[PDB]
Each structure stands twice: as C-alpha cells, then as structure tokens.
Design a protein around this ligand. Structure first.
Ligand SMILES: Cc1cc2nc3c(=O)[nH]c(=O)nc-3n(C[C@H](O)[C@H](O)[C@H](O)COP(=O)(O)OP(=O)(O)OC[C@H]3O[C@@H](n4cnc5c(N)ncnc54)[C@H](O)[C@@H]3O)c2cc1C
Ligand SMILES: [Hg+2]
Length: 420
C-alpha cells in the first residue's frame, strides 16, 4: 500500500520536538501505531543544501520502506551512483579502496520527502514553533512554543539535535569542527592542477577521502561531474564564520596537499560553512525524573561522524519509542519510555563509544599496522541486519519485568563482548 492506514486510536497523545531524522520517525511511526501526534519544529522550511550528502544504512532503509511503497520511487533520482571510495593518506598516497543495500543521497532532499509523506498521512506538523521551557507534572508533560503558547501531552519526545535545550533541562548540568561546501566544476575544469578530480566523472560519481595528522577530508563528485561537494573535519577551529583560507591553511602542513587544495580553493564564499562539532559522553539516563520526557537521537547520543549511523540510530530510537508506547498502553506511558530506554541505550552507546575510538584510529592512524593490513582501515552485520521493531516485540515483556525489577535482561541487539 502506497499510504498505509494507522492503527486504531490508542488514546496516547505525543508531542515530538524536531523535524530531523529522530523527530520525523517518531511522529510517523507513532501516527501509524495509533498515537495522537503533534510535531514542533523551529525552522519554517526544510533546509536544502546540495553539499550535505549522507549515508543511510539498510537497518534504517527497511524501516522507512515500511511507511509506504512509493518512498523508494521518490528517493531513486537522488541516490548517488557512486560505488567505491578511494582512501589516501596525508601524503596523497593510496591506502585502500572501500565499498560505498543503503542510501547514499542528500539530507535535505530525504527530509523533504519524509516531511511531505508525513503530511500525506495527515500528521499535525507545525513549523516555525520554537520549543523551550519544558515542564512535567503527574500524568502529563509539555513545552512552551514561541514563549506564548503552552502545550501538554502524555509524553514529550525530544529530538532537537546536538544543541538540545531539553538535554540541558533534563540533566540540569570538544574542539572539533567540520568544513562543508558545494560547488559547480566549471571554473575548476579550467585549472590543470585541479581538473584531475573530474576524471571518469561522467561515467559515475567518484569519492576521495584523505586521512592523517588529525585531519579528514572527503571529496564527492555529483551530476556527471558537473558538481562536487567536500567536507573537512579538523581541530583548527579558532556568531558564525567560515573562510576558505582557514580550510587551505588546515591542509598546508600535509605533504600531499597539492591535489586536494587545488580543488577546494575554487569554493565560492557563500557556499562554505564551518560548524563546530559537539560530542558528549553517554548520559546516565534519557528519561526525566517524572518519566514522561525522553531524549532521542543526537540529543541523547551524539556520534563522531565516522560510523555512518547517527541518522539510522535516531530512526531506530523513534521506532522503538512508538512501539513501546503502543505495547504499554495509555496507563503505562512512563513504563513505555523506560522500556524503550533499556532497549535502545546499549545499542546506541556501543556505537557511540565505537565512533570515539574509531575517531582516533582515523585521524592519527598507526601507519605500520595499516601497512600490514589496510582492509581494517576503511559496518558489521549486527548493526546493518538488525530489525529494531521485531526485536522490540520479542523482548518487550522481558524488558518490562526487568524495569519493574521482576527479572533480568540480557541485551542481544548488541554483540556479546562487543565494543563496536
Ligand atoms: C559531518 C556529519 C556527517 C554525518 N554523516 C552522516 C551520515 O552519513 N549518515 C548518518 O546516518 N548520519 C550522519 N551524521 C549524523 C546525523 O547527522 C545525525 O545523527 C542525525 O541527523 C540526528 O538527528 P536528530 O534528529 O537527532 O537531530 P537533527 O537532525 O539535528 O534534528 C534536530 C531538529 O530539531 C530542531 N530544533 C532544535 N531545537 C529546537 C527547538 N527548540 N524547537 C524546535 N525545534 C528545534 C532543528 O531545527 C532540527 O530540525 C553526520 C553528522 C555530521 C555532523
Ligand atoms: Hg527504490
């Protein structure tokens, strides 16, 4: 069915904050499971950036496809035809060639498709609604919208990103930045020191990633070589500000700076951003003291962008929350959030800690171990082949007994003796 009908009304009212991957998933899955949903987002429109490429893992694709058959046909023209990424070191020397189902596509174009699909389902989405001043009573929780309107519900699902005000409220208590840019390759094609990046681009999109000396640079061609995007993770970050001279100065110490610098120096000033990255250690809890406010997504577990699972885990967060609310019922909303936390926390934390350790291995690699084995340098099956919704149905009763103290719970959505 291109438009699935929701289950019978469960009587549970849910307030979702954020139009990201966590918020949209929480709203869509909750609506289809019978919950009464309102989604609050501060922006007036989904931001569209041609240089914001993202990878969605198969564990999240299968969840998205279950919301409607047509969604695959909508994303198909926006999927990259790139198949492999060429990995080089900071001397511009080849290391290994890595692959990359899965969706390698544009962020804003995928959010727009999911947002339009949510409106076709009849979900109450309210843009231009800035949320703050979270509050909680016995039996209800809520927010304040635009400092003029009070809203209340059975629970509040906070997916407001890394800069979460809800996390600051719930808790009460890094130096990394990321350049990102998009460009058209007309002027770059006239530079012989930079025209190399257009080689074989009409055939398919090419991906180049450089690692070393605390810097990561990725260059991705698009549209038969007519456009390219790039991203640069670094610790040289000094209102907002972005300058191409800072990106070039970051690459200056590299012995193999010539080929990458010759490309990115053609970036137009108005198409370059330099955002600070936010990482925090795993939280003690995602659920408020009263039990009716819960953090999901980046608000609960920000990752280092090297695992390609931040959006997928935010999607898994929203599906499990909506599933636990359906299985618990109206009179056990606090139990539902505690159950979803105990299911999700081990899986999201293993990946969170895995991104921090993998971050060290990629920005300051042990080149002697990489020389003897580069295939390790470049995601396992316990992540990609997982079905969060079926696992939640399988262990829900066991987790309820563990939350109420009746029994034990062994998490099996993570590998035994598992680091990442
Ligand atoms: C450089 C980089 C590369 C990445 N690459 C990938 C990748 O390839 N694959 C992948 O899966 N993940 C990737 N990620 C991670 C991914 O971006 C995030 O994990 C994911 O977007 C988290 O979603 P979210 O819903 O939690 O938050 P967000 O997507 O950040 O959404 C937060 C939303 O809440 C809104 N909001 C904030 N405050 C308020 C408020 N007070 N009231 C109302 N609304 C508010 C914001 O406008 C926003 O729409 C990457 C991250 C980075 C930094
Ligand atoms: Hg498809």
């Amino acid at each position: 069915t291109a438009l699935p009908t929701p289950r019978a009304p469960t009587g549970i009212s849910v307030i979702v904050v954020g139009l990201g991957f966590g918020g949209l998933t929480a709203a869509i899955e909750s609506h289809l499971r019978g919950h009464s949903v309102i989604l609050l987002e501060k922006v007036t429109k989904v931001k569209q950036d041609a240089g914001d490429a993202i990878v969605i893992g198969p564990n999240a694709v299968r969840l998205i496809k279950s919301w409607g058959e047509q969604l695959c046909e909508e994303i198909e023209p926006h999927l990259s035809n790139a198949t492999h990424a060429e990995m080089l070191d900071h001397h511009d020397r080849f290391i290994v060639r890595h692959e990359l189902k899965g969706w390698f596509t544009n962020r804003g174009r995928l959010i727009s498709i999911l947002y339009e699909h949510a409106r076709k389902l009849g979900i109450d989405i309210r843009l231009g609604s800035r949320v703050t001043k979270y509050w909680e009573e016995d039996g209800r929780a809520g927010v304040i919208v635009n400092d003029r309107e009070r809203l209340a519900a059975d629970c509040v699902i906070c997916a407001d990103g890394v800069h979460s005000a809800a996390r600051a409220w719930l808790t009460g208590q890094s130096g990394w930045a990321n350049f990102r840019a998009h460009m058209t390759t007309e002027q770059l094609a006239k530079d012989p020191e930079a025209s190399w990046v257009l080689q074989g681009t009409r055939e398919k999109d090419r991906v180049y990633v450089w690692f070393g000396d605390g810097i990561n640079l990725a260059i991705m061609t698009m549209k038969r070589g007519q456009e390219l995007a790039w991203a640069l993770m670094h610790t040289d970050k000094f209102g907002g500000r972005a300058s191409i001279d800072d990106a070039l100065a970051t690459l200056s110490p590299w012995p193999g700076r010539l080929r990458p610098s010759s490309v990115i120096r053609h970036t137009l000033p108005e198409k370059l951003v330099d955002h600070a990255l936010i990482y925090r250690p795993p939280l003690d809890t995602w659920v408020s003291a009263g039990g009716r406010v819960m953090l999901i997504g980046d608000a609960a577990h920000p990752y280092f962008p090297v695992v390609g699972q931040g959006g997928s885990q935010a999607i898994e967060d929203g599906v499990v929350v909506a599933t636990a609310l359906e299985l618990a019922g109206k009179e056990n909303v606090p139990l539902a959030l505690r159950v979803a936390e105990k299911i999700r926390y081990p899986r999201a934390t293993v990946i969170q800690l895995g991104s921090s350790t993998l971050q060290e291995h990629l920005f300051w690699p042990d080149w002697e171990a990489v020389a003897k084995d580069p295939s390790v340098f470049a995601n396992p099956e316990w992540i990609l082949g997982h079905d969060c919704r079926e696992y939640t149905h399988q262990v829900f009763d066991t987790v309820v007994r563990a939350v109420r103290g009746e029994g034990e719970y062994i998490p099996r959505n993570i590998p035994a003796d598992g680091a990442y």
